[PDB]
């Protein structure tokens, strides 16, 4: 009964029917070339192995900090456990042997720590780097020190983009496992390298290096999907007797009419500039979601559509005359003696926005839960909403900017040389008429099929031209071959994955701006600072729970565990503080000294927000002088834990999916051995099962129970095999399995 009409899969590429990758400048047509990721990565790993060989044969091994030698050794052991060829594996182990000897001699405590990491995991470098040791690029340091022969241009570009950490050079399974375990409870990793001058943030480079390793997604909609199945036209077998004796109000271009059954009949008249196709599309989508509500398990109250037809503008302008905004309405609707109206019957809460301040925090929590759940359940079904709200960046050059002014929640991924999230222009007028309601979702007409993200659609060609046409910058231009080489042009093959993650991030950004608008409107009527702080604290809780529900719906991770993984990465306290500070005009009263002293507190361990523009009093940051912006002009957004929360959410979703891919790729390799299809020694089978153990979700136990069962079957195939290297980790798995099956027994009674 309950299932989705869309299904995921892998495709060859998304680079079909795109704008040809050329940059036209001064009559020159500069071709744009891709720098292959998983080939330059391998070239650099081989240069690293050569550098390790030079380091060993140079006897300068004592002149390396003993934690970097431990890092080199653990990386070599992990890398040799990831290789499948015997010759390369044995070369890597012959490299790792002298380092192990030197560490056992010089630093016996570091050696005792290494030897306990190794009897625990097959990739012991991921557990060694779950802390601020990740910010040390030991691989690149060794490459720079001993490989004096110059790197090529592709390797130089790879070094430039991924200069921060050394995990950006791990092969796919090791990097996916490290990324997923960075979010573990026992991890202190934070993608922030606070140095003496700059305080580099690279939380986006994590998702950038994760996505360049993925395979292009493709969503196939079923035959009975809304955007595949066709239904007959709409028959005007029903007309609504519009009577000003029952008109409640005029909301935008919708006339609300009271009902004896306490519902509200909305008559949505055609806007100026839209065809009958839009109104009939909304009719069809409403009927679809009413038909398939129990299947999708949607929480919203849905607008039951009654009809769609044409009425004389005389009747509209005579019913609408007795109101307040009757003139404004008269300018919105189209100019014609007959107007297309769509008539539905919605509950009253459908016309209350989500940021409405007449709802207590309990009702706001329930409504935000409903809206987030339905948004992501419909994203799983193949339906996206590119216009939940009109969030904009820099209205100034709107029409001539590559993004058309529209706000990109993941701007660092979808552009070359863009490092922070930019200013939100009039962040409150952007959600003024949001499509999130106290009952659920609304305005289901300006939806889209998810397949518009993976193809060169009009939405994609309109807003994401930079991503789809390749990246250019005067420094990419290889003056010899006359083409601009870039790691960013490769994203042409994969641009659908970036747009998927950007859709998730922008859903969450709209939820955040809606909650911030609610808080800003509801705390203006209060002077009791404790209650205002309690409001903003509960709103931060709502935001983090909404991101955890997004993660749960997309990946399946339980919501509590996803919340814990999130709270490892983004600080909820600094989020509540920064939202309270910047989403209210109260910082406009403070002078310079008090402003800096309060930023010291809200940022708490990282640089402050530096802005040079004058604050309009009573307003805040503003370029027009009457509506508040989130950020200065030509500068970033001051909500930094929001950006970290968005990137943590999308990185968790995509990394969980990729780690499940690695897990099943290794599980089928394991099962091909326990059936005789690949006859190898006992060490090969045990290494396979142990690698399978190293690829399970952090704190997910049924995966480890599965791997343990495979290990038992492997022992039943190789009876007399020596298991002195793997008995420990699977003993721990058996112990925690016994603990779980005990807790569930006692907890029941």
């Amino acid at each position: 009964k309950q299932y989705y009409f869309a299904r995921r899969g892998e495709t060859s590429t998304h680079d079909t029917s795109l704008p040809p990758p050329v940059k036209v400048l001064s009559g020159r047509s500069i071709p744009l070339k891709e720098i292959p990721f998983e080939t330059t990565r391998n070239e650099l790993v081989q240069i690293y192995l050569t550098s390790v060989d030079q380091l060993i044969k140079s006897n300068k091994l004592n002149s390396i900090p003993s934690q970097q030698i431990a890092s080199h050794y653990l990386f070599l052991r992990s890398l040799a456990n990831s290789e499948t060829d015997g010759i390369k594996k044995n070369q890597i182990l012959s490299l790792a042997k002298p380092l192990g000897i030197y560490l056992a001699s010089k630093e016996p405590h570091v050696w005792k720590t290494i030897n306990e990491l190794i009897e625990k995991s097959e990739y012991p470098i991921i557990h060694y780097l779950k802390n601020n040791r990740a910010h040390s690029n030991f691989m690149l340091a060794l490459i720079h020190e001993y490989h004096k022969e110059p790197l090529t241009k592709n390797q130089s570009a790879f070094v430039q983009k991924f200069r921060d950490s050394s995990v950006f050079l791990f092969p796919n399974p090791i990097y996916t496992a490290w990324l997923a375990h960075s979010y573990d409870e026992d991890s202190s990793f934070n993608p922030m390298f606070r140095e003496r001058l700059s305080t580099n943030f690279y939380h986006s480079t994590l998702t950038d290096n994760l996505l360049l390793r993925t395979e292009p997604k493709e969503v196939t909609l079923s035959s009975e999907h809304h955007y595949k199945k066709e239904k007959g036209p709409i028959d005007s077998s029903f007309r609504y007797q519009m009577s000003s004796d029952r008109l409640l109000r005029i909301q935008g271009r919708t006339l609300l009419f009271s009902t004896p059954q306490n519902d509200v009949v909305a008559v949505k008249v055609q806007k100026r500039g839209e065809p009958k196709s839009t109104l009939e599309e909304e009719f069809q989508m409403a009927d679809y979601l009413l038909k398939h509500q129990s299947r999708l398990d949607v929480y919203s109250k849905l607008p039951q559509p009654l009809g769609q037809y044409s009425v004389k503008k005389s009747e509209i302008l005579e019913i609408s005359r007795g109101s307040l905004d009757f003139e404004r309405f008269k300018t919105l609707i189209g100019d014609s003696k007959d107007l297309e109206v769509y008539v539905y019957k919605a509950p009253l809460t459908y016309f209350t926005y989500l940021h409405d301040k007449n709802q207590d925090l309990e009702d706001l929590t329930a409504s935000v839960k409903t809206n987030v759940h339905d948004l992501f359940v419909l994203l799983r079904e193949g339906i996206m909403f590119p216009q939940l709200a009109d969030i904009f960046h820099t209205h100034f050059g709107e029409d001539e900017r590559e993004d058309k002014g529209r706000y990109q929640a993941l701007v660092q991924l979808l552009n070359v040389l863009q490092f922070q999230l930019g200013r939100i222009d009039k962040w409150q007028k952007a959600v003024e008429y949001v499509n999130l309601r106290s009952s659920g979702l609304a305005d289901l007409g300006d939806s889209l099929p998810i397949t518009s993200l993976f193809t060169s659609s009009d939405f994609t060609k309109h807003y994401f031209s930079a991503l789809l046409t390749g990246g250019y910058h005067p420094t990419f231009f290889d003056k010899s071959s006359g083409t601009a080489n870039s790691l960013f042009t490769g994203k042409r093959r994969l641009f659908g994955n970036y747009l998927y993650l950007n859709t998730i991030a922008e859903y969450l950004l709209v939820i955040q701006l809606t909650l911030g608008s609610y808080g800003d409107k509801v705390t203006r009527d209060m002077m009791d600072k404790p209650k205002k702080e309690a409001v903003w604290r509960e709103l931060a809780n709502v935001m983090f729970t909404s991101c955890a529900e997004a993660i749960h719906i997309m990946t399946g991770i339980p919501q509590s565990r996803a919340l814990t993984l999130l709270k490892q990465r983004a600080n909820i306290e600094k989020h509540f503080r920064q939202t309270q500070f910047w989403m209210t005009p109260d910082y406009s009263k403070l002078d310079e000294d008090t402003l800096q002293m309060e930023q010291y507190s809200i940022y708490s361990g990282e640089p402050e927000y530096e802005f040079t523009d004058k604050l309009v009093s009573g307003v805040g940051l503003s370029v027009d002088g009457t509506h508040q912006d989130l950020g200065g002009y030509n500068r970033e957004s001051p909500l930094r834990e929001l950006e970290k929360l968005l990137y943590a959410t999308v990185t968790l979703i995509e990394g969980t999916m990729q780690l499940d891919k690695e897990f099943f790729k290794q599980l089928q390799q394991v099962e091909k051995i326990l059936s005789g299809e690949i006859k190898t020694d006992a060490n090969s089978c045990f290494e396979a099962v142990a690698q399978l153990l190293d690829l399970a979700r952090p704190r997910c136990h049924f995966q480890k129970r599965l791997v343990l069962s495979y290990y038992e079957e492997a022992k039943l195939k190789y009876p007399s095999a020596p298991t002195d290297a793997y008995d420990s980790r699977f003993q721990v798995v058996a112990k925690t399995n016994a603990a779980i099956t005990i807790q569930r027994f006692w907890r029941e009674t």
Binding site: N132, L151, N415
Partner: protein
């Protein structure tokens, strides 16, 4: 390099020492009353978190001024071998700062009793050793070379002897703790002079003046009472060496010994006893004797002792403000305050060395790919010009800084055209990855720059010939993708009308 303010290791050690020792109420019934600033309780108000963080900053600043003094050709001290505080490495300084986080962790009151002294010092040693035993993982591989290393530092914490003048770690950890207790002792003219003559033995006059100027600015930053030096005070002079007095013998002349080869040597030290004339010697007459005037600058020079501005009305309620308790109970906040203070103390000697002075951006980066020999010949000049501008405390220095700046023609590569800069350091690294980055600071809009429209964050700057660029600090920020050192110079724009 290494900085106390952005380390997350000394910060973790300080957070530990606070959550376990420095944030716990006193139990000694001797000045154990926890104060209440604003609404927040401050238990250890004299040897708390603020004190330890200021001592760490003192160690950092002392080694910085020593390095700076070595460049201009000074004659420093000797630690039993060819070495001085100018030769302390960043790892040794990190070890010293980790030690200084627990130096007063094991106290229970402000009793100066010798038995209490040794008890508190050995309890501090025990707390330090317990922290090291707890976090041995990331301490012995990198921070502490061996276990004999941790034992040496725990033995300099316990301070069983008084061999402060033995090794650089001893001198740092002990001066930083003694020079801080100079705003509480009542007679400033004696304690300040004692600490001044005890520190200038190691570094020098011009650098000790800087240490104490930046100390006063640290006090202002962390909301502490700032004493006022005055070379015409009539309070009886107390010798901080021990606790004695100076009495003049029967006409006006202090009682002095009769040693070999000279009847004019060390003043005779007298404990507090009877008089009659046998009257004591006040700090005024003590600071103008021939054997102390020619070695102490403050002889005949005064200080205001407070904020240049706000009077005692709001000064008291800013000292007793709520942000003082927050500075006493948050490592992040106190570190931010000390960091801002040190940055302004690094910049302001330039502004005061010269005469009085869309939106323009403050910080503008400009990459450059230069040679290596030329880069060395550039770093030499930049450091030689940085090591001539110390934060003077008593004597306003000279126009010599102005003449050295104008004679040093390093500023020609920094301008004289329409330079193409940016406000992102990542853009300089991820596009050109230059090896010589010039970071120009525009504190008050003196740098006429215009946006050119990622070339939206890029700017075009033109340096007016009435404005000069003076180097604040050379740096080293890793290696570029071509495998070469990347030096991040730092300049500041100053209105220099005399540079026509």
């Amino acid at each position: 390099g290494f900085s106390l303010y952005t380390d997350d290791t000394v910060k973790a050690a300080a957070q530990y020492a606070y959550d376990n020792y420095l944030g716990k109420p006193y139990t000694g019934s001797v000045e154990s009353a926890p104060a209440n600033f604003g609404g927040r309780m401050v238990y250890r108000q004299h040897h708390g978190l603020s004190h330890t963080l200021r001592t760490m900053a003192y160690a950092e600043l002392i080694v910085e001024e020593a390095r700076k003094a070595k460049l201009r050709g000074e004659t420093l001290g000797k630690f039993k071998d060819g070495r001085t505080i100018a030769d302390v490495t960043p790892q040794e300084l990190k070890k010293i700062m980790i030690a200084q986080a627990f130096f007063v962790a094991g106290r229970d009151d402000e009793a100066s009793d010798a038995k209490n002294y040794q008890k508190y010092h050995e309890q501090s040693r025990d707390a330090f050793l317990k922290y090291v035993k707890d976090n041995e993982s990331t301490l012995i591989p990198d921070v502490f070379k061996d276990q004999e290393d941790v034992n040496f530092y725990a033995r300099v914490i316990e301070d069983k002897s008084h061999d402060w003048e033995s090794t650089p770690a001893h001198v740092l950890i002990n001066q930083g703790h003694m020079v801080d207790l100079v705003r509480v002792k009542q007679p400033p003219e004696s304690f300040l002079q004692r600490y001044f003559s005890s520190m200038q033995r190691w570094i020098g006059s011009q650098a000790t003046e800087a240490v104490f100027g930046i100390q006063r600015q640290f006090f202002h930053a962390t909301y502490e009472v700032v004493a006022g030096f005055d070379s015409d005070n009539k309070e009886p002079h107390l010798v901080v060496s021990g606790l004695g007095r100076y009495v003049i013998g029967e006409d006006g002349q202090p009682i002095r010994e009769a040693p070999k080869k000279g009847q004019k040597e060390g003043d005779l030290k007298v404990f507090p006893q009877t008089y009659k004339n046998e009257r004591l010697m006040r700090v005024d007459e003590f600071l103008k004797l021939p054997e102390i005037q020619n070695t102490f600058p403050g002889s005949g020079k005064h200080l205001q002792g407070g904020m240049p501005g706000m009077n005692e009305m709001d000064y008291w309620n800013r000292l007793n403000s709520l942000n003082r308790a927050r500075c006493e109970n948050d490592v992040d906040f106190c570190l931010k305050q000390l960091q801002t203070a040190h940055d302004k103390a690094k910049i302001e000697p330039i502004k005061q060395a010269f005469q009085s002075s869309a939106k323009p951006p403050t910080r503008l980066f400009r990459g450059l790919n230069l040679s290596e020999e030329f880069t060395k010949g550039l770093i030499d000049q930049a450091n030689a010009m940085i090591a001539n501008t110390t934060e003077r405390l008593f004597t306003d220095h000279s126009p010599e800084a102005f003449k050295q700046i104008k004679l040093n023609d390093l500023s020609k590569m920094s301008g004289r055209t329409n330079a193409s800069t940016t406000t992102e350091i990542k853009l300089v690294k991820e596009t050109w990855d230059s090896n010589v980055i010039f970071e120009m600071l525009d504190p008050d809009g003196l740098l006429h720059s215009k946006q050119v429209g990622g070339t939206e964050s890029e700017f075009s700057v033109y340096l007016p010939e009435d404005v000069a660029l003076v180097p604040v600090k050379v740096t080293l920020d890793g290696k570029t993708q071509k495998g070469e050192n990347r030096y991040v110079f730092t300049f500041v724009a100053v209105k220099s009308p005399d540079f026509t």
